[model samples]
Target: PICTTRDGVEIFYKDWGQGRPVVFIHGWPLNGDAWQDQLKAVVDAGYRGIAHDRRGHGHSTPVWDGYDFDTFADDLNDLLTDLDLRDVTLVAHSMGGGELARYVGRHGTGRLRSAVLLSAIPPVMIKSDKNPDGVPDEVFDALKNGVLTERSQFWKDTAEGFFSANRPGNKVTQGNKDAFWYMAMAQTIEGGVRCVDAFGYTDFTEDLKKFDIPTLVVHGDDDQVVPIDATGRKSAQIIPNAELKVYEGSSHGIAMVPGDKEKFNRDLLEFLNK
Candidate 1:
């Protein structure tokens, strides 16, 4: 429930707990509350597990324009410097993953400790002649078009993607669906759409190669949102010392996925605590 950034559009970040810091950055369609379960776990684990509302998401002011990974990263830079937090363990999900790769690759150690990218989209999410390893600009463009034109349906389908990996066995509760819905509805369409392009099209080839921090990339083997082959495997290959932890039979939703989230949080702690 704290605000910063002044004229630059305030970003809401959580600064709870009492130990080595852990900042959780949510994905494209959710805010800090997306990490509600993990937040309690890490805080109980005696760590300052913080989460923030991305611009255009949650309580943060939304803009019709100016949605990109660089700006998001810059805001994070400002947040850390303003609070004087250093050597942090940054845990990022989905596009938040790309922001970490691009930002740390470009402007790291500005209070950085180690980073964990869960289902992160790094190196590059789009395919180009320059990056045969990426997903392709057209794919991202199609998404932008969908969000711009068919926002409601896109949001619903996207919610399903986050809730499960189009699999029947992935059990979801009514309470879980309601909670996750609030997180999804909080997302402003304009910023969300623009960030899709930002993460998907913006190449992070150098960023991945340049990240010199102790990094971890944890991805679900069945994540439909960010494929393991294109994102997880490719990222681990590019990042110099990044450890990749793949969860077998898991989906895109890490926070609510009925498994041990402590391993993910603890992995970050172990790296930062070291």
Candidate 2:
């Protein structure tokens, strides 16, 4: 419950329990509540755990602009500075991952003791001269436009892609799938719309290219939304010293899968504690 301003936008954050700090940042259309499992785990593991609702999502105020990576990094800088949060092990998923990469590269890894990128899109998501096989630029533009034109349908469609295992034989429980849909649809349309373009279009390659920190990248081999081959692998390749680990049969939502999830949290704790 504190106000951290970068560009006059107030971000809402929640801090729970107490000890050495571990901060978790959520992805698009999802709020700080999405990290409930990780927060509880880290708290019990004897660390202060915190998560925040980014602009245009959850309890945070909506901004007219400042949706790009530079601005997002600024917001993160402000949040950490205002709270005087240091020696932090920052864990970010999907969109938040993009900001973390840029933040570390541009701002350097001062507040961060370590970082974990979970299903994060980094080293840029767009196709260019170097990344010939990367996601097409038109696709991102189409995504931004779709969100502007029909955000509800866009979220519904995106949620399905995120949940789908890609491999036909793989099956997810109906209950688990339903929960994802519920969490996604519960977000406001404007938040979803803003994020569609914000994280997707932000070019953080230079930021990642310049970053020097202890980074752990955990990606599911079966992740279909933010494909590991493209996003996570590229990030691991770019960073000076980054650890890349693949979860055998996991999907993009690997963080929420109870048993494996606990192990992943423990792994992160071990890395931070060491």
Candidate 3:
């Protein structure tokens, strides 16, 4: 159910099925539960599925510090080492992409088979002298402020924009939005805020360069949270032997973006099986 990292942080995870390992790392403000559907999809198809709640989110312990990518990636290494998972397919989404890149960079994909990045955040998302295409600092500051003031309402309001455009009759239903809200609320306010800072500012450009496995990067053209041009496209450009798959008209939350999961699952399975 869980494993304690070297630093004594108890990270929660779900180990499912009995076959080649398919590890799912979730986005910010949400937990491993966000990958429940994907996990079951891979598991029922005769594969091992592992989804872990990063520290301070879901069932993992709320930590005061160590929200940086170093710890996040190390926690992943601990989980994989504890489980002795080999031939692993690391499927990461949004902020989880940073964790994935950090792990492969720091730990190297020694036992890894491949990787799938879904609407991932890599190659940097913040605007700096190096990454001029990234979102402005004020944009991230607004998020931090909202989280500090109204964590619940912020997620509730933010959920509308997580996927499709927050407008009349988007394909993503209110039920989907509600589920996102519930997961965001599950996180500790401090942890959520710290992660926002981490994911927003932490540059993963160097991390992306260390990837040696066959990596599949999937991003939607309509992604607003982490733009395709800023993240996935740049990531694919840098990561050696990485393939980029663009979903037309889909949003940031491409995996659960209305009628997209089926196609997304299909693509993921095809890549993994290949």
Candidate 4:
């Protein structure tokens, strides 16, 4: 169904199966459908699978505002509070990690049991005097410009690096690239443009430190979108007692790859059972 936020944004959500809750938050310019594989695996393993479309994405309202992490995190809280979900495990991918980190930072971990971050962006991504290794501002600016001017082609081109399809012997098919383009093109222009700042510049170092529950961080060593050294590796170091899992020769969109998807699902279920 849907959860209506305080700002009156109607967020479309899916709640399937039954048992302990496994909530999923998807990447930028993508909806809850991005978690279909993980959701099915969780459901088959006897856990509740819950995912929602972010405001201005998927079936949600295409508002001009609330694309920032604070609003994103609040929306997540509203869903959890509305559904009365407790002892939940949150699974986040790409930009979703910022929302998850900000949620725990703002709302605390009282309702959470554990957390999983896959190809996530956290602990800050902007290059600055403080974060020398972060991506440069010009890079995100270029991305925003591409979204503003030619999002259709931009998304198509990005899918290659996203899934490492440009690499030799990559398993990402045309269908996978087409699906990624479809999802990216479905989002609002405002959402797509503004999110570059949200996911790219937002500092999540403090937020990540607030994660007290069991946490699992997964990333591809060969990810070109969100680099492993800047995000996954550092996030693992920041989160207390968090476990880091690295997939060799994997891309940012691991869930879309056959072998990586299977391995990730197994690791996810194992973490859940732990």
Question: Alpha carbon lDDT of residue 179, candidate 2?
Answer: 63
Q: Model 3 — TM-score against the truth?
A: 0.97
Name the TM-score of candidate 2: 0.88
Whose TM-score is greatest here? 4
Candidate 4 to truth, TM: 0.98
Q: Could you estimate the TM-score for every candidate?
A: 0.90, 0.88, 0.97, 0.98
Model 4, residue 272: C-alpha shift (Å): 0.3
For lDDT, the strongest prediction is 4
What lDDT does model 4 reach? 0.92
Candidate 4: residue pairs that collide: none
lDDT of 3 by residue, 1-274 (tens): 9799999989999999999999999998899888877888899888999999988999898888888898999999999999998999999999999999999889998989999989988978898777777889998899989999988889988886687656465688778888899888778888878887888988888888888899999998878898888899889989999999999888877676657888888888889896
What C-alpha lDDT do the candidate models reach, one value each? 0.76, 0.76, 0.88, 0.92
Q: Write the per-residue lDDT of candidate 1 for residues 5-54, one digit (tens) a residue.
A: 74568888777888878888889778898897788877887888888898
Flag regions of model 2 displaced more than 4 Å: 165-182, 185-190
Off by over 4 Å in 3: 167-169
Clash pairs detected, candidate 1: 126-135, 126-136, 127-135, 127-136
What is candidate 2's lDDT per residue for 22-127, written digit by digit as tens?
A: 8898887677877888898899889999998877676777666666677777788888888888888889998899878778866888777888999898866766
